[PDB]
Amino acid sequence: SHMWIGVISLFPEMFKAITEFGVTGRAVKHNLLKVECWNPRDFTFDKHKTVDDRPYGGGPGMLMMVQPLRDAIHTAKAAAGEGAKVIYLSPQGRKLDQGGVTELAQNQKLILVCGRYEGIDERLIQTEIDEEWSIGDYVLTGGELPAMTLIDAVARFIPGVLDSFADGLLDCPHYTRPEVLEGLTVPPVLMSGHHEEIRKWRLKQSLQRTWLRRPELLEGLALTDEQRKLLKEAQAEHNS
Amino acid sequence: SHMWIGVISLFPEMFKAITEFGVTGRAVKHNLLKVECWNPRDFTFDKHKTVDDRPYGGGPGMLMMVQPLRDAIHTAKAAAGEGAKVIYLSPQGRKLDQGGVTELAQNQKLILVCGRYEGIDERLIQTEIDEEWSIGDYVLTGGELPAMTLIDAVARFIPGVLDSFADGLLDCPHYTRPEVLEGLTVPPVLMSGHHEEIRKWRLKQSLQRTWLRRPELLEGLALTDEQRKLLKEAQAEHNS
Ligand SMILES: Nc1ncnc2c1ncn2[C@@H]1O[C@H](C[C@@H](N)CC[C@H](N)C(=O)O)[C@@H](O)[C@H]1O
Ligand SMILES: Nc1ncnc2c1ncn2[C@@H]1O[C@H](C[C@@H](N)CC[C@H](N)C(=O)O)[C@@H](O)[C@H]1O
């Protein structure tokens, strides 16, 4: 299947980072993922193509100018046609996690609005935006990196395009050549050829790492009997 | 002051998204921020410049090949000289938040290692990496977008380069022209010219929004007396 993403951005060339390189670049070249961009600057009418505006109430910073941004959004909505969810990237939005990625990946079309400066007029959020999403509790200069983050995370769910959080757990450690690196050996179980011992080792590692690093993640999980056993074993070894 | 960031990446051209555009692009052009990249592919010796390798233990996926990546890291460390903290971007790392951004922005030099495929050998993390950092609880195809996210967030703290989370709170809504948009008016207080009423309105909005959207964030805060009062007022209005 295929996903279409419309993007509204003052810096559409930023999106080459995902459309020209790696797994996502190959998805775009093979038409599994389509990304189309509209730039508010192209919707300005004044001589200097002004895309910012002063905030009412004074104070510092500038906002994106309403008219060019609104017009861009309307053009993208017309292109997307029916059924396209419009998302504004913002640190005030729903914090993205793998559950949220799986929800978003159920959409065949999304339009992603990328802010710049201090953001966008609150009434455009009310009138044009369906959902606000954050990539994390930190502030960036623009919504393009968050949009690309979202695109990359969802694109991994597109069939044909290709884990931590997959089953709620951090990933296990991985090893490749050489067998010994600075005196550190690959765990012998991984060279044993024993698929079931390997499976159990990787799962116990994931449990152990999640417990030590992110114990709060473990709370939200309903572990299988095997997972409970392997976790107890890891905790007992840690104590020992 | 100035920050130097060394990056290890198979796709260094991705970083044009931050070095050529917007506030971060201007920081780079003005030498406030320097980003230097090393590509493991340039450290290969075989005819086809192989940069991946098979994981011990079978199963799917590939890892970054150890030797080219190790060699790249060593070249970057030599360039950074003394005092450079080496960070691996990974969903198994410390989850980035504004507190973590402020900590990271205290470094004059960082080297950021970007994984691809299923990641990197665990022993390289032990032998070469100082800290592991995640941008969020979701899985991406590569560490370049996370690295750029980190770079952008920290660059905002570089003097001369230029909020939500700043004082622990979500940002207030902002408004710009026109005064009426699809029947929605700018709050009159913001046109009143009264700086103190405006200050209080924006703070009460931040409190209200944080309470409604992210009540867990409010718990971690020690509110001022004024903030407690404004929050109580907002809650009373919400009830009314
Ligand atoms: N964590 C984030 N998640 C999603 N988008 C973000 C994030 N941080 C910044 N942005 C984008 O960057 C744009 C410009 C920001 N400097 C505005 C920040 C705004 N003053 C705030 O603190 O909420 C915002 O309009 C968003 O589109
Ligand atoms: N949330 C994230 N934060 C930081 N780096 C990430 C994140 N997600 C993916 N990456 C980078 O993307 C690379 C390739 C990933 N597909 C590997 C994921 C690994 N299998 C895991 O689940 O932990 C990783 O080596 C990281 O460098």
CA atoms within 13 Å, Cβ hemisphere of A27: 29
- Given an 8 Å threshold on Cβ–Cβ distance, is B145 in contact with A149? yes
End-to-end CA distance of chain A, in Å?
Answer: 50
Binding residues of B for S-adenosyl-L-methionine: 88, 115, 135-140
By Cβ distance, the residue of B54, B153, B213 closest to A138 is B153
- What residues in A contact B18, CB-CB < 8 Å? 145
Give A34's strand partners. A4
CA of A91 to the centre of ligand 1 (A): 5
d(CA A154, CA B173): 29
CA of B162 to the centre of ligand 1 (A): 14
Q: What letter represents residue A145's amino acid?
A: L
Q: Which residues of A145-178 are buried (b: 16+ CB within 10 A; e: fewer)?
A: bbbbbbbbbbbbebeebeebbeebbbbbbbbbbe
Question: Where are the strands (E) in chain A, listed by range?
Answer: 3-8, 33-38, 52-53, 63-64, 85-95, 109-113, 131-134, 180-181, 184-185
Q: Which residues contact B49 (CB under 8 A, 6 or more apart)?
A: B41
Residue A64 contacts residue A52 (beta carbons within 8 Å): yes
Pocket of ligand 2, candidates B9, B140, B141: which has the most ligand atoms within 8 Å of its Cβ, to mutate?
B140
* Count of A-B CB contacts under 8 Å: 252
d(CA A139, CA B65): 34
Specify the CATH architecture of the domain B1-162: 3-Layer(aba) Sandwich (3.40)
Check: CATH 2.60.15.10 for A163-240? no
CA atoms within 13 Å, Cβ hemisphere of A195: 3
- Given an 8 Å threshold on Cβ–Cβ distance, is A136 in contact with B97? yes
Q: Which residues contact A15 (CB under 8 A, 6 or more apart)?
A: A7, A9, A35, A37, A144, A147, A148, B17
Closest approach of B147 to chain A, Cα-based (Å): 10
d(CA B168, CA B36): 33
Please say whether the dihedral angle defined by the alpha carbons of residues B229, B231, B237 and B239, taken in this order, is positive or negative. negative
Q: Quick one: tokens of B118?
A: 């299923």
Q: What torsion do the CA atoms of B85, B86, B88, B94 make, to the nearest 10 degrees?
A: -20
Nearest to A164 by CA among A230, A231, A99, A94: A99
Give B7's strand partners. B37, B112
Nearest ligand for residue B64 CA: 2
d(CA A107, CA A195): 37
Residue B34 contacts residue B2 (beta carbons within 8 Å): yes
End-to-end CA distance of chain B, in Å?
Answer: 50
Residue B122 contacts residue A209 (beta carbons within 8 Å): no
Q: Which residues contact B139 (CB under 8 A, 6 or more apart)?
A: A98, A101, A153, A156, A163, A164, A165, A166, B91
- What residues in B contact A216, CB-CB < 8 Å? none
Residue B204: is it exposed, middle or buried by C-beta count within 10 angstroms (0-12/13-18/19+)? buried
By Cβ distance, the residue of A136, A156, A174 closest to B55 is A174
Residue A107 contacts residue A63 (beta carbons within 8 Å): no
Residue B4: is it exposed, middle or buried by C-beta count within 10 angstroms (0-12/13-18/19+)? middle
Nearest to A1 by CA among A30, A26, A40, A21: A30
By Cβ distance, the residue of A16, A23, A186 closest to B56 is A186
- Given an 8 Å threshold on Cβ–Cβ distance, is A11 in contact with B24? no
Q: Quick one: tokens of A125?
A: 């959020």
**Residues shown for chain B:** 240
Nearest ligand for residue B124 CA: 2
> What are the DSSP calls for B70-126, one per residue?
HHHHHHHHHHH-TTPEEEEEEEEEEEP-HHHHHHHTT-SEEEEEPPBTT---HHHHH
Ligand 2 binding pocket (C-beta < 6 A) is A 163-164, 171; B 89-92, 114-116, 118-119, 134-136, 138-143, 146
Please give the angle made by the CA atoms of B15, B19 and B23, to the nearest 5 degrees: 130
Residue B58: is it exposed, middle or buried by C-beta count within 10 angstroms (0-12/13-18/19+)? exposed
Resolution (Å) of this entry: 1.6
d(CA B6, CA B84): 9
Nearest to B144 by CA among A115, A163, A11, A148: A148
Residue A46 contacts residue A180 (beta carbons within 8 Å): no
**For residue B178, cis peptide bond before it (omega within 30 degrees of 0):** yes
d(CA B73, CA B38): 8
CA R_g for chain B: 23
Residue A136, marked binder:
yes
Tell me which residue has tokens 């046609």.
A81
A131 phi-psi bin (left φ>0, alpha ψ -120 to 50, beta other):
beta
Q: How many CB atoms lie within 10 A of CB B180?
A: 10
Q: From A61, which residue of chain B is nearest by alpha-carbon distance?
A: B162
**For residue A178, cis peptide bond before it (omega within 30 degrees of 0):** yes
Q: What letter represents residue B177's amino acid?
A: R
Residues of A with catalytic annotation? Answer: 163
Q: How many CB atoms lie within 10 A of CB A32?
A: 17
Question: Where are the strands (E) in chain B, listed by range?
Answer: 3-8, 33-38, 52-53, 63-64, 85-95, 109-113, 131-134, 180-181, 184-185
d(CA B223, CA A190): 52
**Residues shown for chain A:** 240
- Given an 8 Å threshold on Cβ–Cβ distance, is A92 in contact with B149? no
Residue A9 contacts residue A37 (beta carbons within 8 Å): yes
Mutate to test the interface with B, among A19, A126, A131, A145 (most CBs of B within 10 A): A145
Tell how far CA A155 is from the center of its chain. Answer: 9
Residue A91 contacts residue A98 (beta carbons within 8 Å): no
Residue B209 contacts residue B218 (beta carbons within 8 Å): no
- What residues in A contact B198, CB-CB < 8 Å? 57-59
Q: Quick one: tokens of A35?
A: 């990304």
d(CA A23, CA A33): 11
For chain B, the domains span 1-162, 163-240
Tell me which residue has tokens 């970083």.
B15
